Amino acid sequence: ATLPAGASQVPTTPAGRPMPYAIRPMPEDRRFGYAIVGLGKYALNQILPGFAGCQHSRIEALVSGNAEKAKIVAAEYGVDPRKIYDYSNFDKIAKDPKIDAVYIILPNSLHAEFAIRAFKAGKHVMCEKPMATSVADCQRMIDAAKAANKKLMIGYRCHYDPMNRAAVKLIRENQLGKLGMVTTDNSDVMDQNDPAQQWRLRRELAGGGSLMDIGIYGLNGTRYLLGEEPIEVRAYTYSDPNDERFVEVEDRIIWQMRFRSGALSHGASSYSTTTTSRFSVQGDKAVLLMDPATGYYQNLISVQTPGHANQSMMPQFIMPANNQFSAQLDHLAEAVINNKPVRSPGEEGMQDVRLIQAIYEAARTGRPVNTDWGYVRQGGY
Amino acid sequence: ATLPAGASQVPTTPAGRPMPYAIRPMPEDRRFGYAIVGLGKYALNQILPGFAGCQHSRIEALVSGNAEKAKIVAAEYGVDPRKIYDYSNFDKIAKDPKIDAVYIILPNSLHAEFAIRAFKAGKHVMCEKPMATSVADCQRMIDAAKAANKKLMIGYRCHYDPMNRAAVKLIRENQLGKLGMVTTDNSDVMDQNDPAQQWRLRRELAGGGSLMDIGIYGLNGTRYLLGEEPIEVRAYTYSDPNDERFVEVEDRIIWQMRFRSGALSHGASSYSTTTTSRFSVQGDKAVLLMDPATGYYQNLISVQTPGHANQSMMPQFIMPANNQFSAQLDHLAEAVINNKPVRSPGEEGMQDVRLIQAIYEAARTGRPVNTDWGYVRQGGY
Amino acid sequence: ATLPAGASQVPTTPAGRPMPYAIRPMPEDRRFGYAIVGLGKYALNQILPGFAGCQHSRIEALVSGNAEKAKIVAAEYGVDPRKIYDYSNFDKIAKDPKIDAVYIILPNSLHAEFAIRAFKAGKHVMCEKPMATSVADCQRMIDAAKAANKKLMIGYRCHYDPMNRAAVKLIRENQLGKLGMVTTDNSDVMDQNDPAQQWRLRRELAGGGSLMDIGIYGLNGTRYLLGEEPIEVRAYTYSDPNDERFVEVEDRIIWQMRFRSGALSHGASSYSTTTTSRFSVQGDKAVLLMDPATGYYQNLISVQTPGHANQSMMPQFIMPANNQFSAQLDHLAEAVINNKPVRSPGEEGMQDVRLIQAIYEAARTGRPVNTDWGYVRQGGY
Amino acid sequence: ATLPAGASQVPTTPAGRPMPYAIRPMPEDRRFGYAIVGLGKYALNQILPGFAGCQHSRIEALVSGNAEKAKIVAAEYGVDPRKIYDYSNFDKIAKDPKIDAVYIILPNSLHAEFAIRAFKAGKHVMCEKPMATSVADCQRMIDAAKAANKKLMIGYRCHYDPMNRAAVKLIRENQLGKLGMVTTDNSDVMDQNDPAQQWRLRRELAGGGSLMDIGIYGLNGTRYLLGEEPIEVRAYTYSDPNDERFVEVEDRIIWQMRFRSGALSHGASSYSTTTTSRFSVQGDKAVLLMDPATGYYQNLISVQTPGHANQSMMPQFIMPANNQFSAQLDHLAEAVINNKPVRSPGEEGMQDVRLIQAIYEAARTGRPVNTDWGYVRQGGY
Numbered sequence A, B, C, D: 001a002t003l004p005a006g007a008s009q010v011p012t013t014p015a016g017r018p019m020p021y022a023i024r025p026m027p028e029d030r031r032f033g034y035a036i037v038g039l040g041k042y043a044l045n046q047i048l049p050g051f052a053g054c055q056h057s058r059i060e061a062l063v064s065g066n067a068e069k070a071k072i073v074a075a076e077y078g079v080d081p082r083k084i085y086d087y088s089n090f091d092k093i094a095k096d097p098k099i100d101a102v103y104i105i106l107p108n109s110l111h112a113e114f115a116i117r118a119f120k121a122g123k124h125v126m127c128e129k130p131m132a133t134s135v136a137d138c139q140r141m142i143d144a145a146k147a148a149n150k151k152l153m154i155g156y157r158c159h160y161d162p163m164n165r166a167a168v169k170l171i172r173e174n175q176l177g178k179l180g181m182v183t184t185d186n187s188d189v190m191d192q193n194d195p196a197q198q199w200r201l202r203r204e205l206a207g208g209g210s211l212m213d214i215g216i217y218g219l220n221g222t223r224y225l226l227g228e229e230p231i232e233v234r235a236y237t238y239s240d241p242n243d244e245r246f247v248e249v250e251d252r253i254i255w256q257m258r259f260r261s262g263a264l265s266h267g268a269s270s271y272s273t274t275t276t277s278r279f280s281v282q283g284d285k286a287v288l289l290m291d292p293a294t295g296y297y298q299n300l301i302s303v304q305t306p307g308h309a310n311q312s313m314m315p316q317f318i319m320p321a322n323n324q325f326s327a328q329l330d331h332l333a334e335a336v337i338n339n340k341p342v343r344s345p346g347e348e349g350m351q352d353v354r355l356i357q358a359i360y361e362a363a364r365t366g367r368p369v370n371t372d373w374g375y376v377r378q379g380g381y
């Protein structure tokens, strides 16, 4: 009965020790510089604070219209003041080699714009969701990327969230069986007094109501969970005509879709009901419930069968995977380096916009809108 | 300190004691006698077994077309062999004073016929859902009910399930705020080898597919959870064309509704995916999640707000309320003894059938169907 | 495609059909007749109500000291008024061939007496736990059982509860790995105003405090979850000195054990805190959490590993196994009919009593008590 | 029906916007510099990466024995290489005004040492748990802090974890009622091959087994949950004599405690069973279950009562509170600035060590160890 060699071989005095075991993502290099456009809610609450956890990304320069603020932010994240661009001279970034790409976090209407401008600035483009307010504008963004021979990546963080990935994997391993019915719901009360929620009420900047903003989650979700595209869609929308919030954009809208596989889906988004992010995938062996489904934190999934409910969630002491944000940032830096295609290409953001427009059309005409245009997902969902 | 009077006064020898505290519904009488029509799957697995927990009901007679089976069930439940009736001599129950009501648990297309025959036989009628296969038939049952001056109740067990009533209660107390979105799903894999599912695949006997069989739960649930009736419905249905199960009845169907209050809903029923009974009611203050929502056992409900999930389910040592089956059985009994209306009258059953026809009609035409026809829930939801 | 033979062959008119699929335990016979001794809280809330789901048992006679109460319960359960016995003429059951066994549900201190009298009366015996108030008395019951060549079973409902048996099963399949720590807690607020709790505060009638009443669950549970017996016990007990409830029996007691395999355990019982029934079994591969663990209803179990929580509980539409109450009742019946031993023989009851005395002794002396006395669970845990 | 002023007043063109709403901790100043000693597992996996989220803390200098490593780390976190101290010249830090305090994250045996040395270096001391390997050594650490007129803060992160705080609050608001039984368990398999787990096996560096390392959580927990100190304690320990891991330190140990309030507790820690962090507090109105109880992430709490389970956890889109780590770091920086006493003073770390030694004694002698020495918690628990 004797103690292990390693143990007994430890200096009962101050001594140097080896690299400890990594039970969570350790910082590596920082060879990718980002140009963050629009210092808004998402940019300052979830994106910037998510760089610290990156393994290959850094905030090289900011791009804000507000000076007082922009300077303050630059301090908190320690960015060279001489590198605080704006909407006027955003193009000058092409004169800095330390700017590998830009991350546009502006209202949907301004997405396409600064993307193309950025592409000519010889930088990679990471644009937020939804890609743009126009199908065509999405296409122009792509073309620009190809002309400038650069990478185009939309901000689909759920494509890099551990639980969402585990969700796709269990479904690919056929744990639910033959897929037949998906149900999604994404909701949160619209606050008109919130600076970030105002341009969302404006059909010009937003490009749509809840669907364009959060219903896109269920739409996108339904797509990568099923692992295929809708071939047909129907939809109905409605908003309280007395509510000033939805004069231009829609509050609630419900869409039904069919897939070549034969599977059906029905989901909805809302601006008048509180926090809801719930996905449901039904197969003939089991049903998957993701609730939370697409949150920033605390996502939880469960596979249910009579008498059983197997749940998954981030461990309580370890982090076998990085958070969606950092993972997303380093996903571009990583696609550039090893010269690989991104999982969230502009081609993907475009597909969502078409389908959304197809939906709005269905809601407008009250007829089904054929969406069998032959889109193909590059690199699987 | 010393022992209280209660304990100090307990004899140490064998002695009679008081009535004990009741922590569950105790039996009381067996005044109300039923005649069960149709010894099938629901009857033998749920209803018959349900008479034990009743406080006022008993099984007096059986009505089957399978003598071999009747004698067996009859002996299993201590029913008098003389009280076995077949479908042709069914009407003679009018001669038995000890038969107060019948419980029709026959295929949907046969409900009307026996309800009517039972009324002419001068008996009260409990009839399973769907009420019937035609709106008109629901009316003939109601008319016949009014002619015999007897009561007509449709078997909506969920109207007597502790958790459902609790979900209704917290909603009416405005714990969710203004209601805006309601989602429902009800699915279970159809197995044509099961004797009970065989007539369910026959349009002539079933009246319809998954909506008629289990979608009705999401429908009815949506109505008593909101406490209002829909003014219009839209819907789409699809069934694999090569699946022999759905030659005559629909497999999956999706339907969405709008209510006079402005709230919306979207639900689905399915015969090709595994067990699913789930309701969510989004308010602008909180969200109610019922999952399981309409199970025979283990219903569970959750009120969710960012950071919280207050769950409710049956206690583990006490039974505050009787089970839905026993309650439903005693509800008719009590309403007859105290001369009161039933919470689930034929009018209610008829309203579901009418709505179901509108949904099919809407699925069929691919157009909206106005259902704003002035149905008024007598006695509340 | 076309409809399968099954469906296409369903008559459209009233017709007898097959026996239905069974999704829950169906009644079969009522061969085994019991005589219930002691119409108290457990008898009237759980056991009597439990005879309905039995497949082989029935209530033939009642034994009470409160005639007014006996006639009422007798009428409630269709028992023959002639079959009511008081405590003095109890022995005459020997004259009734239709009485196969007795179910003693009297205060703990009176179990031995009636078990013995019942055996001399030539009947089988079901006796509640604690088996008795003295080790010696457990033996006299066993000896008397052997003399009448009749069976003796202690009422350990948990030995017939689907979830408990499931927890045992996953453990024996090594899903937790080598077991090392087991925690148990069983608590419920003692209310001396309740007639049933009155004798529980009398050392002479109860035999002990919370350990004898509900701690026994953690104890017994610990034993069948590990599948082995403890070799030594240590314990401490404390009760507010000014609380009239605990003048003679203990309120809270904590006890820890060591098993021949090396595993340890620490549990507690309590009469002054609210409802608690929780077991955790830590292995080096996973952890089992039973909560509720020993409830009358809604037991729930969870196997936990970093990032997962696989839960199990009764299904919502099917009843794979009969409830613990009905099962326990039929277990004795079956064992008599098929000439087999019972899973819960007096030896098992006696082992708990012996262990309980060791725990009290250990609490009293503040010293360890060796319990390595060679008890062997016949038939497995 | 017209759109809100704020909305309509947004430039459909690139425009500067105001500071967005903060739905999570925003970075403020960075006026507090930390000196991190020992670049081990905890230091590089949970502490350093937690500085980024601070509001007033920064990593000014490192103190490692290993040079190659230390330099690498310094890069990742961007620290001035010229500021990479070591165990030889750790004292020179007194020559740098930008070092406001040191954070000792060395083996327990080396805690007291570098603390006092640090205090004479005119810096504040943040020492990890357990405070030290000697009661006396704890006292010397305090004295040094008072002599150098500095602040002494132990690393009790659970004192700064949102859920743990919510736990204390609900208990203070009397939601559980009168507290009477606490149950804790802290376990994780010991990996001898893990560089960080080796000195823990050495009684000289560790100062104890699981209790000193993780059982301290349940001990500490029991204390701040109850909000009072134990007046008496008993304990038993045991380890498989064949396991090489526990030749010196103990694997498992179970302790029972009593409080002046009259409340009782029983908890345990383990090195041979997998991940377990579960606290249970029983009152006469409700029971609180914390599971996870003290994890790095995903903590969850539930208040249970018959039929109900109200759960709390971090929201899925917002962060109303900072993580325990950052919160802990900024807690010192904040106590220094506004000149306020820390909630985790050396006086607190000392109390735990005494109690632990008192426990080990109880486990050693097998007798109860009186702990009524009159400790008083400064600033509440």
Ligand SMILES: NC(=O)C1=CN([C@@H]2O[C@H](COP(=O)(O)OP(=O)(O)OC[C@H]3O[C@@H](n4cnc5c(N)ncnc54)[C@H](OP(=O)(O)O)[C@@H]3O)[C@@H](O)[C@H]2O)C=CC1
Residues within 6 Å of the ligand: A037, A038, A039, A040, A041, A042, A043, A063, A064, A065, A066, A105, A106, A107, A108, A110, A128, A129, A130, A155, A156, A157, A195, A196, A197, A199, A213, D010, D011, D012, D013, D014, D015, D016, D017, D018, D020
């Ligand atoms: N994937 C996800 O989870 C989420 C994605 N998003 C997306 O991020 C993008 C930004 O929206 P969000 O941060 O919420 O909103 P905000 O209103 O808070 O910020 C918009 C930012 O864009 C700039 N901007 C330029 N022109 C305008 C204009 N005319 N009106 C308003 N802002 C302007 C501003 O930068 P500055 O003031 O500094 O000059 C401002 O900070 C959207 O495309 C949104 O869909 C949002 C939330 C989550």
Ligand SMILES: NC(=O)C1=CN([C@@H]2O[C@H](COP(=O)(O)OP(=O)(O)OC[C@H]3O[C@@H](n4cnc5c(N)ncnc54)[C@H](OP(=O)(O)O)[C@@H]3O)[C@@H](O)[C@H]2O)C=CC1
Residues within 6 Å of the ligand: B037, B038, B039, B040, B041, B042, B043, B063, B064, B065, B066, B069, B104, B105, B106, B107, B108, B110, B128, B129, B130, B155, B156, B157, B195, B196, B197, B199, B213, C010, C011, C012, C013, C014, C015, C016, C017, C018, C020
């Ligand atoms: N509320 C609820 O939760 C549920 C309600 N139900 C309802 O109960 C009713 C019966 O359905 P269910 O028990 O599942 O089905 P079953 O097929 O198992 O039984 C139907 C019964 O009615 C009698 N019957 C008479 N003529 C026919 C016929 N031509 N074809 C089939 N059966 C006939 C038979 O009884 P016998 O052999 O003795 O003559 C048969 O057992 C339906 O209206 C259904 O909607 C069903 C499930 C759940």
Ligand SMILES: NC(=O)C1=CN([C@@H]2O[C@H](COP(=O)(O)OP(=O)(O)OC[C@H]3O[C@@H](n4cnc5c(N)ncnc54)[C@H](OP(=O)(O)O)[C@@H]3O)[C@@H](O)[C@H]2O)C=CC1
Residues within 6 Å of the ligand: B010, B011, B012, B013, B014, B015, B016, B017, B018, B020, C037, C038, C039, C040, C041, C042, C043, C063, C064, C065, C066, C069, C104, C105, C106, C107, C108, C110, C128, C129, C130, C155, C156, C157, C195, C196, C197, C199, C213
């Ligand atoms: N396995 C389980 O889950 C449970 C088992 N039990 C066990 O059941 C047995 C009865 O307890 P419980 O039903 O709770 O208690 P009760 O006090 O409610 O009833 C005891 C019954 O025994 C009879 N009795 C005869 N003499 C006495 C006496 N001197 N004092 C009190 N009662 C007397 C009475 O019946 P009558 O009036 O008709 O003469 C009385 O109703 C106990 O041994 C207990 O441990 C209890 C709860 C749960």
Ligand SMILES: NC(=O)C1=CN([C@@H]2O[C@H](COP(=O)(O)OP(=O)(O)OC[C@H]3O[C@@H](n4cnc5c(N)ncnc54)[C@H](OP(=O)(O)O)[C@@H]3O)[C@@H](O)[C@H]2O)C=CC1
Residues within 6 Å of the ligand: A010, A011, A012, A013, A014, A015, A016, A017, A018, A020, D037, D038, D039, D040, D041, D042, D043, D063, D064, D065, D066, D105, D106, D107, D108, D110, D128, D129, D130, D155, D156, D157, D195, D196, D197, D199, D213
């Ligand atoms: N509150 C909490 O949640 C936790 C607190 N801790 C505490 O943190 C402290 C550090 O332990 P932990 O990080 O897990 O362990 P590690 O073994 O991984 O690291 C110990 C560090 O201390 C230094 N050190 C100096 N002398 C020695 C020595 N003789 N043997 C080993 N290391 C030495 C080393 O620094 P370098 O190699 O760089 O020279 C080494 O990096 C402990 O007091 C522990 O209790 C640990 C986990 C969680």
